[PDB]
Design a protein around this nucleic acid. Structure first.
Ligand SMILES: Nc1ncnc2c1ncn2[C@H]1C[C@H](O)[C@@H](COP(=O)(O)OP(=O)(O)OP(=O)(O)O)O1
Ligand SMILES: [Ca+2]
Ligand SMILES: [Mg+2]
Length: 430
DNA sequence: ATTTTGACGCT
DNA sequence: AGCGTCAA
């Protein structure tokens, strides 16, 4: 009752760019705008691998991970933009730079946590308090929420999409108590007004559209964001949680899409997030561990305490390349040449990072996979990163991996290498 | 023979 | 530290 926390103490948003790499390429090439199109890496093998897909192309069934040759069978007029290749490998610089554009705009509104190249969480609690003080008891107009859905509404006693959206928003706003500055639902609504402003700023200043979720924590904001993509935002209130979770597959909640989620389903014999409420905290801890158990117990009730971390920049800078099938590296010269290519890209990125962000990486992580090994990585070894020099970094990486070569023959590398990975970590201020 | 990333937990 | 999980 009066002491049961309800996890309604914060306003958190998650902003997620729509079909991000496609929008970057469509901004650059107007011929691709409003067309079925996809972004591909490499071209020789089956037309290249698709990594991003416009919503027009998704209507034909095109998805990520599909080979372009196969996507063309579903959508013969599919347009393609290719990821840049530099030093023999795919180079994602254009997308990293576009990400910086968006992250810098979002940072004007609030502290952000960069969650991925095209996603950031926003802690809006303080901004909401300020805006509520500005509003001075004035009701919130639907005109301030032109792209907002209220999850769960309309309900109770138009057949078009926008009509339904407006009916739900009207029901929500009609029922708000706009005089109580401590009302969580009012706080979320003001949050959504701010997020409309943030999303408009992003689109105005970059050309990119995005979706967003607004709720009381990161997990619900992320779930909310996906409910009405693209180019829309969704408010998930605390009161919406029981109905929303009652038919929500466990795997849809962030962190439960893999083995742990599968084990929750198998061990407990349930399918939906809401079914978790029937277990005690101790029962959940007994199956899934102390941390996961407490997290699940609160999460299934819509409660999560994970903070929005103040971090706008990536914590690592890495460069990776696979060498599948016959392209596996089987000679010392090959291994050294590719370590150099990776190290040259890494040096360029690190030097730019040091100039932009006043920091220096101090550890180099080298990871490889050997042909035959079932594991993704066969070996992961660190060494000191003391100079931003590609030849030094590639030599040090070779030094730390050379003992993996079983071959008695100096010229040959065995088993052949199917992946190389260099990653700069452990940044210090400079 | 999706690939190229990136954060965070475990021991 | 090196390995594993989960997510863009
Ligand atoms: N598995 C992957 N491998 C490589 N790049 C990826 C992968 N998944 C996503 N990306 C890249 C390309 C995407 O445009 C970008 C953001 O990913 P993501 O948010 O999952 O999808 P998306 O932005 O393309 O579409 P959506 O509108 O559904 O968010 O990251
Ligand atoms: Ca996205
Ligand atoms: Mg994303």
């Amino acid at each position: 009752g009066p002491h049961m926390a309800t996890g309604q103490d914060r306003v958190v948003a998650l902003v997620d760019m729509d079909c991000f790499f496609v929008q970057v390429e469509q901004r650059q090439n107007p011929h691709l705008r409003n067309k079925p199109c996809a972004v591909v890496q490499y071209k020789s093998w089956k037309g290249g691998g698709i990594i991003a897909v416009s919503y027009e192309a998704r209507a034909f069934g095109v998805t990520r991970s599909m080979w372009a040759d196969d996507a063309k069978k579903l959508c013969p007029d599919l347009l393609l933009a290719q990821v840049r290749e530099s030093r023999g490998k795919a180079n994602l610089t254009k997308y990293r730079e576009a990400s910086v554009e968006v992250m810098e705009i979002m940072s004007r509104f609030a502290v952000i946590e960069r969650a991925a190249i095209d996603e950031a969480y926003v802690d809006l609690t303080s901004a909401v308090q300020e805006r509520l003080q500005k509003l001075q008891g004035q009701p919130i107009s639907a005109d301030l929420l032109p792209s907002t859905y209220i999850e769960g509404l309309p309900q109770g006693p138009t057949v078009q999409k926008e009509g339904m959206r407006k009916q739900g928003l009207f029901q929500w706003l009609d029922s708000l108590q706009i005089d109580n500055l401590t009302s969580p639902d009012l706080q979320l609504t003001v949050g959504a007004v701010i997020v409309e402003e943030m999303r408009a700023a992003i689109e105005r200043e970059t050309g990119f559209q995005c979706s967003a979720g607004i709720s009381h924590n990161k997990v619900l904001a992320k779930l909310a964001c996906g409910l009405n993509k693209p180019n829309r935002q969704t408010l998930v209130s605390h009161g919406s949680v029981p109905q929303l979770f009652s038919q929500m597959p466990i795997r849809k909640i962030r962190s439960l899409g893999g083995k742990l989620g599968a084990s929750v389903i198998e061990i407990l014999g349930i399918e939906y997030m809401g079914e978790l409420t029937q277990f005690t905290e101790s029962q959940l801890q007994s199956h899934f561990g102390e941390k996961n158990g407490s997290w699940l117990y609160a999460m299934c009730r819509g409660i999560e305490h994970d903070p929005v971390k103040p971090r706008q920049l990536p914590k690592t800078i890495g460069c990776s390349k696979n060498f599948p099938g016959k392209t596996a590296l089987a000679t010392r010269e090959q291994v050294q040449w590719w370590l150099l290519q990776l190290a040259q890209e890494l040096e360029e990125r690190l030097t730019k990072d040091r100039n932009d962000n006043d920091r220096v990486a101090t550890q180099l992580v080298v990871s490889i996979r050997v042909q035959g090994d079932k594991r993704l990585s066969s070996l992961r070894r660190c060494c000191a990163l003391t100079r931003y020099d590609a030849h030094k970094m590639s030599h040090d990486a070779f030094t730390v991996i050379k003992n993996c070569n079983t071959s008695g023959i100096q010229t040959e590398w065995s088993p052949p290498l199917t992946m190389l990975f260099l990653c700069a970590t452990k940044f210090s201020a400079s």
